[PDB]
Amino acid sequence: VSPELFCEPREVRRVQWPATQQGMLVERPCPKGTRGIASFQCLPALGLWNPRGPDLSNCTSPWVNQVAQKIKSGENAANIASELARHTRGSIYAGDVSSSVKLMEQLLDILDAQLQALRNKMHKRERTCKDYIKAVVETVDNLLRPEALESWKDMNATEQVHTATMLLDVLEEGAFLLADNVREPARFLAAKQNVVLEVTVLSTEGQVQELVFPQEYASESSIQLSANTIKQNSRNGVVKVVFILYNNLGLFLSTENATVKLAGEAGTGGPGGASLVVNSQVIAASINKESSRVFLMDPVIFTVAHLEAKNHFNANCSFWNYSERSMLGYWSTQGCRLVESNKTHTTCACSHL
């Protein structure tokens, strides 16, 4: 009878894991300082531990429940969001990352409720929205700082995608809530180390100028909408536009099933390495409403610096196509076209939002 393979007992992520049969998933308590259940997959056939490490996505710090309790006691959403921003400044575990994003979603719904109750009210609504937005922009900045990225990697691939997608979704939704509570003309720009957000509400009457984002920022990415596009999308004489860019988020938006077109062989830079990667920041433009899927006669144009030029090729202009229901997605090239590309930069034109 040929041998069975087993993983060795190992301490990984400060959890002691038992000797385990190949193929088995094992559960153990989350590490000291957190609550929840951790798991670790012993790979089938190999009898080696999953090289990505244990799944700590269920492991949370005490502050997560504290914030959840503030929500129950009916505290103001903007104020709670501010506490969340503070908590994410420090050490955070994988479970804290996804909980933070879920908490921002919950807070957005609470905020929207408070806003409908104020349907001096107008300036109050605006102040409250801006307070919320500043808090979530800070929270996102905290979650994407380089020292927080290892915590994201303590979630499995699917949880990383789900969390990143929820993050993209909640920030955009929050931005459009702000757009509903400012008076034209308005421009609100918030620039941080790992995220920049702009909300602008403009009249389409008379002279309209193209929009270029960001401003006040030495950017690795920029995006623009033509004056005609703005005119063509007028609603009651106004347009509401949301722009966002993110640093490091692309790490988590998996290229599995990406619909890219390769003109050559894709390899890797190491054993078990990736052959297709997001090689730019993620940069977003939306008009009037989230997920409009509107066709643009004048395409949106964006230019990005490559994160690493060396040993990469075959730039493909893409957008994140995701389901609001499942919060999962994939990169699609549909309706996007490469305008120019060299070793260090690519310019793209996409015919839709």
Binding site: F313, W331, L353
Partner: peptide, 15 residues
Amino acid sequence: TNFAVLMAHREIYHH
């Protein structure tokens, strides 16, 4: 809508 540029890692090296 959220946009980015994907790239492949090289496989083949000559000369």
